[PDB]
């Protein structure tokens, strides 16, 4: 077809500028979070160190300890699972709470809120940012509120936001990768802005497709990236959908009515730690330091052991390196007088490296969770000491549970607002099985 | 492919491969039996009804850990490294213990390797004066390799399920700490238990 | 046009299966390595040949199997039955039906 | 965390009745439980007094 396009550059720049600054301002934080996640995923060696170890013949061995602490924190959060509840401010409002406590609960069982909360907590432990979308979905009885989980690498926010729930954030959005056929089926009007994206980006791989190497997007399975962004305009919150080539949905007011009857951003995001540069990081960062000392000192102590240092007399008619390699072998031989070869001592180096490795292991074990909440500790200690260490670790983990609680409360509030916005009388009767709940239909 | 990985048919049987595929297009879920030759079952809407009354994929699957590259793995990957280190250090200590390093004077009319093999045997002999052959010390290497192996054993013990949860004391505690250690192990395995519970719930709903 | 549609659908299905198989090659290889390691196959062919040439027997000390068995036994001891609960009291009997069905 | 609101309600009834501070009649208690023979128990408890 003709498809007259390429209207102007100003419109495209104004459309993609917010995503551009979101990508640019959080490059270091995203790289650090990706490194922490890779450390959690049994990837604690760089390419250069692995190449050097392969060159020297030493295998690369990783003693992963971050995963144990992250699993302990996640299990602690799982064991403290709670249910949504509405409490009446005054006795005459009691029945009103008895409505909401039901309705919200239904949503938390319709969307499997437990699993989404669990993965949100996992990302909070690892990357320090959780994003939950409170939207709508089609059901048999009508439209129902729906809870969706946004991956840390598929969600961008206002870099200038300082609060941990993003009260002051000007905008936030989600990147979604969709097949071209599905995109055309879902939005046939915006066929002129859906452009193939086959080339992978190496400078910024955070918002690309999860499988980096995909040799099927040429013609077989074409994939595109679409950004859904909600931004606080002077009039109010506005929602838009766009791509790198244009606007899928032109800037329009947000369709999700908020708590106070005004359009609101459905995305609820929480963070664990914020630095002086507004970079958000999780607890895994604290374990990044010692973990390397667990690995590197492991390698060096192994290198000092399978190799020997020898001084060779110049009268020897053999290569020094060959003689050293022969003497390093358990069944090696040498032909010569006593003084031709002298083995220098290197046991002190290995012993010192082993002691430093043990010290680093103790430090990481005490670091973060006290290692007793995971039932590991250090041994040779009484039960009362174990309980005291577990209580101390639980106290040190109060902020994590507080973040989870705040995210849950925000999600429940958005769920109640969406229920008031979209539920009808028939849905109220079908779900709650109470006639009086028809009083609660709509916001008036 | 076929599990036995033999496929002799010298013929014994005839094995064929089919693929069931459930795929969600723009309008809904479809199911198809196919091989590379053709369609055993033509693409049709899925004959299984979901929660919402629409066709849905009957397969319910779960995974333990997901990598940044959409890679899925279990708990064995953590213990892969320590097990390799244990085996390698064990083999190195075995090689070091049963072998000796000898420096042989150039005035010996025998092969150096043969002399080393003779001196490595418990009942070996050598002919010559005092300075003909010298035995280099290698016990430090074996002892330190054994220490590294013990450290790797401790690491692999502390890596997976708790030893106290697994029935191993390793320290002979007072018994009260055993209950707390088991509670910690349960906390660690809570993620795995939740995965199993979610899979069971999905299966029951289907 | 039935033949063309069937050919296109078959090509799409085969392509989908091939893409799924190819994109997970490293993950499948790692999972197979872990499974073999659990099944006493913790030594490579080259290292086994080197040990055989050296005359040193290949000895395997397996500790992964113990942890896997402990986890499986824990999961077995925390077995639970399916259960249906009613959202409202009037649904009570209905839930019972599911409890008698599933 | 409770599977249903009725389960938490029954647990609260247990907590109130165990102390013995307030008198909780057994009919409402059974109505709030999750027993399969609940209609039979309710009918047996709510049956009218004997003509004697």
């Amino acid at each position: 077809m003709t498809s007259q396009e390429d209207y102007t550059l100003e419109a495209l720049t104004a459309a993609v500028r917010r995503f551009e600054e979101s990508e640019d301002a959080t490059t270091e934080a995203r790289a650090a979070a990706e490194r922490d996640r890779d450390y959690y995923d049994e990837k604690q060696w760089t390419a250069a160190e692995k190449a050097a170890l392969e060159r020297r013949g030493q295998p690369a061995i990783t003693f992963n300890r971050i995963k144990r602490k992250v699993n302990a924190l996640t299990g602690i959060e799982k064991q403290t699972r709670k249910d949504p509840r509405a409490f009446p401010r005054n006795p005459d409002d009691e029945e009103s709470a008895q409505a909401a406590t039901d309705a919200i609960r239904y949503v938390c069982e319709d969307s499997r809120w437990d699993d989404k909360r669990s993965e949100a907590a996992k990302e909070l432990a690892i990357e320090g940012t959780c994003a939950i979308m409170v939207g709508v979905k089609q059901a048999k009885g009508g439209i129902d509120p729906d809870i969706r989980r946004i991956a840390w690498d598929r969600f961008y926010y206002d870099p200038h936001a300082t609060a941990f729930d993003f009260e002051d954030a000007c905008y936030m959005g989600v990147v979604v990768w969709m097949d071209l056929d599905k995109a055309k089926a879902k939005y046939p009007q915006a066929e002129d802005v859906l452009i193939e994206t086959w080339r992978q980006a190496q400078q910024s791989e955070t918002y690309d497709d999860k499988p980096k190497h995909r040799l099927w997007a040429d013609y077989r399975r074409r994939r595109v990236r679409i950004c859904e962004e909600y931004y606080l305009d002077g009039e109010g919150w506005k929602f838009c959908m766009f791509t790198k080539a244009g606007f899928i949905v032109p800037p329009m007011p947000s369709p999700y009515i908020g708590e106070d009857g005004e359009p609101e951003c459905p995305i609820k995001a929480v963070s664990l730690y914020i630095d002086r540069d507004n970079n958000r990081y999780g607890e895994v960062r604290t374990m990044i330091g010692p973990q390397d000392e667990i690995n590197k000192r492991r390698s060096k102590a192994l290198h000092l052991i399978n190799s020997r240092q020898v001084r060779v007399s110049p009268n020897v008619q053999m290569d020094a390196q060959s003689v050293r390699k022969e003497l390093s072998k358990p069944d090696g031989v040498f032909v010569g007088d006593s003084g031709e070869v002298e083995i220098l001592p290197t046991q002190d180096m290995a012993s010192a490296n082993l002691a430093m490795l043990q010290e680093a292991k103790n430090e990481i074990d005490l670091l973060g969770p006290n290692a007793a909440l995971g039932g590991k500790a250090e041994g040779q200690m009484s039960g009362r000491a174990i309980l005291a260490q577990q209580q101390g670790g639980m106290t040190e983990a109060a902020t994590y549970l507080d973040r989870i609680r705040a995210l849950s409360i925000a999600v429940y509030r958005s769920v109640w607002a969406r229920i008031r916005q979209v539920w009808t009388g028939e849905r109220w009767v079908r779900v709650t099985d109470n006639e009086r709940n028809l009083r609660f239909v709509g916001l008036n | 492919d076929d599990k036995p990985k033999h496929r002799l048919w010298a013929y014994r049987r005839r094995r064929v491969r089919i693929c069931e595929e459930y795929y969600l297009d723009g309008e809904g879920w479809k199911f198809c039996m196919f091989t590379k030759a053709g369609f055993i079952v033509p693409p049709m809407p899925s004959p299984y009804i979901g929660e919402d009354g629409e066709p849905e994929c009957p397969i319910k699957a779960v995974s333990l850990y997901i990598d940044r590259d959409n890679n899925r793995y279990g708990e064995v990957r953590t213990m892969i490294g320590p097990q390799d280190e244990i085996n390698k250090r064990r083999s190195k200590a075995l090689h070091l213990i049963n072998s000796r390093q000898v420096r042989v004077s150039p005035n010996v009319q025998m092969d150096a390797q043969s002399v080393r093999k003779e001196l490595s045997k418990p009942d070996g002999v050598f002919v010559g004066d005092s300075g003909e052959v010298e035995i280099l010390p290698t016990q430090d290497m074996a002892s330190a390799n054994l220490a590294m192996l013990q450290e790797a054993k401790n690491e692999i013990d502390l890596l997976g399920p708790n030893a106290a949860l697994g029935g191993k004391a390793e320290g002979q505690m007072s018994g009260r700490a055993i209950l707390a250690q088991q509670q910690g192990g349960m906390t660690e395995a809570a993620t795995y238990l939740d995965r199993i519970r979610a899979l069971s719930i999905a299966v029951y709903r289907s | 046009s039935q033949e063309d549609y069937t050919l296109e659908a078959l090509t799409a299905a085969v392509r989908r299966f091939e893409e799924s198989e190819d994109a997970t090659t490293e993950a499948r290889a790692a999972a197979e390595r872990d499974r073999d390691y659990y099944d006493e196959k913790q030594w490579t062919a080259a290292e086994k040949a080197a040990l055989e040439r050296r005359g040193q027997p290949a000895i395997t000390f397996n500790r992964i199997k113990r942890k896997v068995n402990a986890l499986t036994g824990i999961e077995k001891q925390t077995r639970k039955d399916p259960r249906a609960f009613p959202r409202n009291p009037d649904d009570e009997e209905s839930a019972q039906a599911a409890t008698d069905a599933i | 965390d409770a599977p249903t609101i009725a389960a938490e309600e029954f647990e609260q009834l247990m907590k109130l009745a165990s102390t013995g501070i307030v008198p909780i009649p057994p009919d409402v208690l059974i109505e709030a439980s999750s027993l399969r023979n609940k209609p039979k128990l309710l009918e047996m408890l709510k049956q009218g007094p004997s003509q004697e």
Partner: peptide
């Protein structure tokens, strides 16, 4: 319907 999932029936694990 009469008994749909998450509307009238909640599926969980019991003893």
């Amino acid at each position: 319907a009469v008994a749909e999932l998450d509307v009238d029936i909640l599926v969980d694990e019991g003893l």
